Protein backbone atom coordinates (compact mmCIF):
# COMPACT_ATOMS: atom_id res chain seq x y z
CA UNK A 1 0.00 0.00 0.00
CA UNK A 2 2.97 2.28 0.83
CA UNK A 3 4.62 1.21 -2.43
CA UNK A 4 1.72 2.33 -4.65
CA UNK A 5 1.11 5.54 -2.71
CA UNK A 6 4.79 6.69 -3.13
CA UNK A 7 4.51 5.74 -6.83
CA UNK A 8 1.13 7.59 -6.93
CA UNK A 9 2.64 10.95 -5.85
CA UNK A 10 5.86 10.47 -7.94
CA UNK A 11 3.90 9.96 -11.30
CA UNK A 12 1.94 13.21 -10.69
CA UNK A 13 4.96 15.24 -9.10
CA UNK A 14 7.00 14.95 -12.29
CA UNK A 15 4.03 15.63 -14.63
CA UNK A 16 3.07 18.72 -12.53
CA UNK A 17 6.59 20.10 -12.55
CA UNK A 18 7.00 19.40 -16.32
CA UNK A 19 3.82 21.36 -17.01
CA UNK A 20 4.77 24.25 -14.60
CA UNK A 21 8.05 24.51 -16.61
CA UNK A 22 6.02 25.15 -19.83
CA UNK A 23 4.01 27.85 -18.03
CA UNK A 24 7.15 29.47 -16.38
CA UNK A 25 8.89 30.29 -19.74
CA UNK A 26 5.41 31.53 -21.32
CA UNK A 27 4.92 33.89 -18.29
CA UNK A 28 8.44 35.07 -18.66
CA UNK A 29 7.66 35.67 -22.43
CA UNK A 30 4.45 37.41 -21.44
CA UNK A 31 6.19 40.21 -19.58
CA UNK A 32 9.15 40.58 -22.10
CA UNK A 33 6.90 41.29 -25.14
CA UNK A 34 4.89 43.97 -23.25
CA UNK A 35 8.04 45.67 -22.19
CA UNK A 36 9.83 45.94 -25.52
CA UNK A 37 6.66 47.63 -26.96
CA UNK A 38 6.63 50.03 -23.98
CA UNK A 39 10.34 50.70 -24.49
CA UNK A 40 11.01 54.12 -26.03
CA UNK A 41 8.90 55.41 -23.13
CA UNK A 42 11.28 54.08 -20.30
CA UNK A 43 14.37 55.31 -22.12
CA UNK A 44 12.88 58.84 -22.57
CA UNK A 45 11.76 59.06 -18.89
CA UNK A 46 15.14 58.09 -17.45
CA UNK A 47 17.16 60.41 -19.70
CA UNK A 48 15.37 63.69 -18.78
CA UNK A 49 16.65 63.30 -15.18
CA UNK A 50 20.36 62.26 -15.71
CA UNK A 51 21.49 65.54 -17.34
CA UNK A 52 21.00 68.19 -14.54
Amino acid sequence: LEAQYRERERAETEALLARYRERAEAEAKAVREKAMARLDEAVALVLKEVLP
Partner: protein
Protein backbone atom coordinates in the same frame (compact mmCIF):
# COMPACT_ATOMS: atom_id res chain seq x y z
CA UNK B 1 -27.77 -51.63 29.52
CA UNK B 2 -25.66 -48.53 29.59
CA UNK B 3 -21.97 -49.43 29.36
CA UNK B 4 -21.07 -48.29 26.01
CA UNK B 5 -23.99 -45.85 26.27
CA UNK B 6 -22.65 -44.87 29.75
CA UNK B 7 -19.83 -43.24 27.88
CA UNK B 8 -22.13 -41.15 25.61
CA UNK B 9 -23.51 -39.22 28.60
CA UNK B 10 -20.06 -37.92 29.21
CA UNK B 11 -19.56 -37.50 25.35
CA UNK B 12 -22.24 -34.86 25.22
CA UNK B 13 -21.04 -32.79 28.32
CA UNK B 14 -17.46 -33.02 26.95
CA UNK B 15 -18.97 -32.15 23.51
CA UNK B 16 -20.79 -29.07 25.17
CA UNK B 17 -17.38 -27.91 26.37
CA UNK B 18 -15.68 -28.40 23.03
CA UNK B 19 -18.38 -26.33 21.32
CA UNK B 20 -18.22 -23.56 23.91
CA UNK B 21 -14.47 -23.28 22.95
CA UNK B 22 -15.39 -23.30 19.25
CA UNK B 23 -17.60 -20.41 20.16
CA UNK B 24 -14.45 -18.79 21.57
CA UNK B 25 -12.35 -19.89 18.60
CA UNK B 26 -14.81 -17.83 16.52
CA UNK B 27 -14.83 -14.76 19.00
CA UNK B 28 -11.02 -14.68 18.98
CA UNK B 29 -10.98 -14.60 15.19
CA UNK B 30 -13.61 -11.80 15.13
CA UNK B 31 -11.51 -9.52 17.28
CA UNK B 32 -8.35 -10.42 15.28
CA UNK B 33 -10.11 -9.60 11.94
CA UNK B 34 -11.33 -6.34 13.49
CA UNK B 35 -7.68 -5.74 14.63
CA UNK B 36 -5.88 -6.64 11.29
CA UNK B 37 -8.49 -4.45 9.48
CA UNK B 38 -7.92 -1.34 11.74
CA UNK B 39 -4.22 -1.57 11.23
CA UNK B 40 -4.86 -0.92 7.55
CA UNK B 41 -7.46 1.84 8.15
CA UNK B 42 -4.61 3.72 9.90
CA UNK B 43 -2.36 2.69 6.99
CA UNK B 44 -4.88 4.13 4.45
CA UNK B 45 -5.39 7.56 6.19
CA UNK B 46 -1.71 8.25 6.99
CA UNK B 47 -0.62 7.51 3.37
CA UNK B 48 -3.51 9.63 2.04
CA UNK B 49 -2.17 12.61 4.15
CA UNK B 50 1.35 11.96 2.73
CA UNK B 51 0.09 12.07 -0.79
CA UNK B 52 -2.00 15.25 -0.05
CA UNK B 53 1.09 16.75 1.41
CA UNK B 54 3.48 15.63 -1.42
CA UNK B 55 1.37 17.25 -4.22
CA UNK B 56 0.75 20.36 -2.26
CA UNK B 57 4.50 20.90 -1.68
CA UNK B 58 5.20 20.20 -5.37
CA UNK B 59 2.61 22.81 -6.42
CA UNK B 60 4.09 25.50 -4.12
CA UNK B 61 7.56 24.53 -5.60
CA UNK B 62 6.06 24.75 -9.17
Amino acid sequence: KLEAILSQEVEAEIQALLQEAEAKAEAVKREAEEKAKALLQARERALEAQYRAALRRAESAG
